[PDB]
Amino acid sequence: QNFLSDRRVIADIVEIVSRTNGPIIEIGAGDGALTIPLQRLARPLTAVEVDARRARRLAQRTARSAPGPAPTEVVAADFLRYPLPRSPHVVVGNLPFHLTTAILRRLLHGPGWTTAVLLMQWEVARRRAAVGGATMMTAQWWPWFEFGLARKVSAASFTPRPAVDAGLLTITRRSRPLVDVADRARYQALVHRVFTGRGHGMAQILQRLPTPVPRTWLRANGIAPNSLPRQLSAAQWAALFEQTR
Ligand SMILES: C[S@@+](CC[C@H](N)C(=O)[O-])C[C@H]1O[C@@H](n2cnc3c(N)ncnc32)[C@H](O)[C@@H]1O
């Protein structure tokens, strides 16, 4: 496991979390590198740690730095099995790099959380934030969430050092979804179909798929006929879904 040893990254994460509101849930709390600074924000906090012995040591540490018996709940649990509340909350965590996509899927399908502040592999955070264009997974979640790349974090900021660098990713739940959550599976299937479809450019790709789109549709929606699926915006994907509905 790669613990966050760079205090500047801790400061940066706390700064982003401090601009949000509501209870906080932390994934992979470890020894409390983020837990202790987050507890000083005076908001309700749940710290999740799968290592029971480490979780018990963290519960003593959080209780010691807390005002007293008359707050932070340390839970010894696998986050993949932790029930997220349906009420508004903020999620934060330094993710184990091998469980990143499973944790991301668990969160994206989950309720209540309005902002997620996540530390993960740099290449994943980059693709998730659509740096250089969107990947299929980002476009598949774009009607319900917005992704931001807050910063790059070197492997030297962790102890022990991972084999790759890291990226600090922010995710925000849209208050007004671009596509209804009930149409998620059809929407995500359409996005898969456009990204893996044959053809060079959107005009060629949309011609070769089941239930085609009017010839005037691409240019009427501001999309150049030569553009690639990664160049479409969230609004354009939603307009395409509404068209091929
Ligand atoms: C990469 S670490 C970061 C630890 C700490 N927050 C830090 O920044 O120093 C992930 C932590 O999650 C714990 N862990 C691994 N899988 C977990 C899971 N599925 N649910 C909750 N904790 C997990 C590990 O024991 C480890 O302490």
Q: How far is CA 172 from CA 29, 35, 46, 203, 234, in A?
A: 21, 21, 19, 32, 14
Q: Which domain holds residue 41?
A: 3-173
Give the ligand 1 atom nearest the CA of 78: 20
User: Helix, strand, or coil here: 43?
Assistant: coil
Going by the DSSP 8-state scheme, the letter that residue 79 receives in this structure is G
Task: Write down the H helix ranges in 94-233.
Answer: 100-108, 122-128, 136-141, 184-195, 202-207, 217-220
Q: How far apart are CA 102 and CA 38, in angstroms?
A: 25
CATH code for the domain in which residue 66 is found = 3.40.50.150
Q: How far apart are CA 197 and CA 205, in angstroms?
A: 6
Going by the DSSP 8-state scheme, the letter that residue 163 receives in this structure is S
* One-letter amino acid of 124: V
* Paired residues of 116 in beta bridges: 91, 171
DSSP string for residues in 80-100: GG----SS-EEEEEE--TTTH
Q: How far apart are CA 188 and CA 105, in angstroms?
A: 13
Q: Tell me, in angstroms, the distance from the centre of ligand 1 to residue 95's CA.
A: 6
Q: What resolution in angstrom units was achieved for this structure?
A: 2.2
Decide: residue 4, CB within 10 A, 0-12 exposed, 13-18 middle, 19+ buried: buried
Residue from 2, 3, 121 to probe ligand 1 pocket by mutation (most atoms less than 8 Å from CB): 3
Q: Tell me, in angstroms, the distance from the centre of ligand 1 to residue 30's CA.
A: 5
